[model samples]
Target: MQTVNEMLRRAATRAPDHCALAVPARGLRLTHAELRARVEAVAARLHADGLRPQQRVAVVAPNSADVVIAILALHRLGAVPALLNPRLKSAELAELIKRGEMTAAVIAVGRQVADAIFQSGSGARIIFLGDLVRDGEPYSYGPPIEDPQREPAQPAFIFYTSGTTGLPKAAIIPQRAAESRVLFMSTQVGLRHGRHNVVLGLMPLYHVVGFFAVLVAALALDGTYVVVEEFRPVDALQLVQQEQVTSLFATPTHLDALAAAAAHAGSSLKLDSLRHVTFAGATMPDAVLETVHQHLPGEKVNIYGTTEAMNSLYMRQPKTGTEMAPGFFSEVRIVRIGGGVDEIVANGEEGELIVAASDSAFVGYLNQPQATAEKLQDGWYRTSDVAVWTPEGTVRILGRVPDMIISGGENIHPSEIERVLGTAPGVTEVVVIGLADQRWGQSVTACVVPRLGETLSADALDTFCRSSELADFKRPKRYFILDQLPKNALNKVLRRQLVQQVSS
Candidate 1:
């Protein structure tokens, strides 16, 4: 497949009537032929609306077939789509919008979201995702684009990162890398086969794992992609049973949610359609992995990558001696941390992991050369992740060089947590930290300073964490309400001084 749209076009030619994309909750399903028509119809609308090739656009929507259609439509019109997380707050969304510098966006139909975009003063020409098309179109006027011609260095998608350390940045992944990622995923993980393949589209399309590893990879397989807008534990699991989903590209948390009810019942869910499950983000907890294996029967792929380099290191079986290897089209090097990344480190020695790939590597941060320079050292993208080669020849990731807690496979930035909790009713100051754990690899902990003459309780703090915008995994497991937070002369929270609070 030459481009994202081209892959869908090829699938349409081979199996026009088979379901290409499905949104069960909304009772939406599109055959390959119908999908192609819908894409073109939307593309015509976008083209008519003054979207041209090389122009940038943003897509803000929930997980649905419309998101997929809009992506292909933008590609057809020769505009790159930067998918933004709809779950983010208005301020967060606005910051990303301004940072991404997108003048136009295909927004999901919602008054709250559109109002937020407007309130942000993003200066974007908002096009509603629902307004793009209907169930089918009478005709498509555009010529079929099976093989899009693009330079390997061009940006395909510009997405915001969930930074392990600080604020999320806008990063552009080259189209060449995006296309190569699917081919490599297909070859390495056996992601594609004949018809009977149905993928759970649970990952947010805004992320690299969802767009590259799941969506594009599924379309390349010419398979059915089942879409769920928001992942609800029981509802997601039931969809797999009802649709007989074959392949699922999800984070470990997603699997835990799917297997929870069945694990409680002392049996696996009745999912016969499942053939393989691939997970990335944070490492799966040992207990969760055990339960997943006990219940879900399939090939388990342990995937690891960053927003800068998609699927750079992966192993099929987690905790096995397979050791991590580079993605099908990507390359890796274990280099000394401060040796200018010039010398490869010896086996069994911990070092910063660097990655490079054909078309899958990201271009750089949006218009931020200094930020780009910090990560893209030389030709390789610096992961800032410390990993070591095991004696068994597999890689054992130590953790991020910067202190960040990865709870249940999601990147948890301490600043984000501290910021959320600091604004709580009785919080005066907060410092977040991560400690080594037997299950999740790293446990998130928060040390807080209460407001003067205010009382704090664990139960109340937990409720505050849950009520805030922070994701469930990022919520602090243990909270210490101290008199004050450790701070340096510059008044920055000394995170190192707080790690000891949780290590015990």
Candidate 2:
């Protein structure tokens, strides 16, 4: 039942000299004692600037020591920190700032993107993290403020997710929910103090999986975190070897790039000390899973969750044939899509996956009552995802319910097609979407981006899909080559835009 501030206070007393955060490029290393002192000073400055309990403070910066300080300071003040994705375009960031009603924001010193977002007139007071200490002024530590005594049900963070209806909805995460999940994950993963665990810190802090499951969990267990400004495959691998990193929590795309870097050298990255590798944010392709297993065995963990709920289910090294543990922490059920929607299929069949509310579930969306009402019902969040359960009680994810495409009476999930296409020769990244057709209601078309200096044709991909175990009906009918696939700030494909472009 410890609040974030309470946790920091405990750590500061127990491990005052232990390193809490490190940014190699900035030559920054903050021990528990140093971090706590900085947090107090930053909190006093924020209070002087009129910030109060439950007020929102947004952070629009890259992964660095400054961002860490800002987050800790906000927690000390009982304020919620909205982690903004630095990759987002100005228009997108402006929309989020306006909707969240952020009272203040922390910007990095040389972040042009954040500057642009501030210039959009969002009416938020901007504080530069690098300039927190005034020039020629002796630093004076401020007295600790009394704990606000807010209950665990109070909102601690806000995360935004892209809706299928072309709008972004804010998910309000309560402190209790985050605390429960972080503690569960820390225990399940066997995290220990003084274990010398080092996180790569490549995932954006805005993502729920990264914020709670990785960063907060590390802090709760007193692990050292090394922040990467941005992901560069070569540089990341070198850092792992140089820093002797012990863990990695990254997306499949990031893993794929790192694996490619190791392959070029003929010898493994020599990260023998690395123990845990967690993948989330999107579905991990079977091919990528195999590559990791072949290269670095006994270290892959698949985490499944969304913004509405934190880490719920985990599969340790799930591949084509892996046994799942009994009575997992979460319960997943599949409800059939009846009537006109034949895609539901049949018991132990593929349909919408509904997750029952656990102690770690978020309350609901912020400022979107109607949308929240539609998604949350009977203490269950109807995740608009397609999943099938096996007779042995294993859940297999298909794709998003709206992302399913039906062509000539055949139902095809884009994730299935993308999985097969990703393994195709010369294909780096691919997205499948349904396009309008005269004979059939929709035709399956793939937009692919090839690796540098590689070429592919529609016939080659069609042949590969047909030869594989994939049903011939699910094979893509056509393919278009592009420099890169369009993605939102979170790296999710914009299927609606892809469909429109293909049709036009």
Candidate 3:
């Protein structure tokens, strides 16, 4: 029955003077009591601005303490905060506001962002972050506080997808689900309640990891969530050293950058205070993993799941190339591709992965019933991801079902080819995609981004792949060297967009 609001109140009550949040970029720091007070003031302002409970309010901002406070304030009023990526274009932002039916928005970006929201034609109420945080008298008395016990299962947040394929759909998460997830993450990362743990806030608050694992988890444990507005490797490393950040939850892309920065710093860098490094959102290449181990002194942890359901699988102190096991409450199964849910795949066989709905799982997509119906079936949430059960009984993710490349009638998972090429000399990043071809139906094409100082040739990659364990059939028929791959805010490669570019 404990909700995020209750957790925040408990932390404030138990340790009013404890540091709750820090933003080095903004030169901001707040104690638990101070944070609660500011949250109440912001909530009152939002209420005065005509925001009410159950209304979906878009929070479009980067990583900031203001964003964190606004989210808490939204939860306090039982309003659904639809977190959005600020990097999206005006038209895209407008479309999302319309799609989510957001009646109001809390924006932290410049005037251009609000103009975009206004352009959406939704005529939603807009609240600027600057105005919300500035010292001002309350428009009226305090806003009504939401009781978690009244409707714990009601939707509290709406998270949109990365939209790698198309327009993103909103995933609605309730208070109970978020409560379950935050507690699970706190325990998973071994955060001591009311203790002095500093969590690095590199992940955007709009992201599930940012919202639950990074923000609410710290609130529940009464720890400090150090905010890094934008991820620059050097700046992030400095903040970690400055704040003595204890835990880092980031994507492999972010970890790769940090490892590079630390390696470049060499003898000067010291991350002695970091205790745990948890990675998710994308696969960690073996080369990057090795580099992280060589440079960072932290317990390595890997998590695998979608925004719809957090913490599906995790591995602590995982060996190189080791797969993850189901989380404490997750029930995962691999079913043969194009087969029914009951068509279970044998051990060591590759198939589509499905997870049983957990307490933290989202029931459906907001405003898209068909998409929701297609995803959830018979109590199992279809991940739409290709995965294989290892001989050791662990689960290894391949790639998305749509991202699978079919060439010469053979189904090839891009991750397998990408994994091999990832360790190839001169290769910093690589992606395998299918291009339309007359003979093969879909030609297996490799899009590679070489290291900054390194040059790559088709012959070199072919020689590397030929000498490796990859069979001739799985080897890419063509390679396209590029400066960079198309990526979303979370750094997940946009395979569909890549395919479109290569095909064009």
**Candidate with best TM-score:** 3
- Residue 86 shift from truth in candidate 3, angstroms: 0.6
Better of 1 and 3 by lDDT: 3
Residue-level lDDT tens digits of model 2 in 49-86: 67898998878777766677778778888898887776
**Backbone clashes (count) for model 2:** 0
lDDT of each: 0.73, 0.73, 0.81
Regions of model 1 farther than 4 Å from truth: 109-112, 119-121, 134-149, 164-166, 264-269, 320-323, 404-504
- Candidates' TM-scores? 0.78, 0.88, 0.91
Residue-pair clashes per prediction, in order, are 7, 0, 0
lDDT of 3 by residue, 1-504 (tens): 677788888888987998888876667778899888878877876776667788899988887777788888877876889998887776788788988788888888778878877876786888887667742222335555444343666887889885334778899887778776886675565656756688898888888988888888887887888877778988888888899888888878888999899988876867888888888734677878888788877888878878888878877776754388886777889999877888898776789989988678896898889888878888888888888888787888887888888888777988889889988989999989888888988888899999998899999999999999998899989999999999865447887778788766
Each model's Cα RMSD: 8.9, 3.6, 2.8
1-504 in candidate 1: lDDT tens per residue? 276666667777888988888887778878888787778777776776666677789888877777888887788767889888776666666667776778788887467777777778678887776567544332345444332466667777888876545446888877676676676667667766577878888888888778877887777677888887777877777787888888887777678876776566433457777888877734454567777777776788777777777777777766632247765666778887656767888776677788873467778888788888888777888888777777776676656668656676665667557657767888877777887788987888878888889889988999988888877788888877788776543235656656764446
Where is model 2 poorest over a 10-residue stretch in terms of lDDT? 133-142
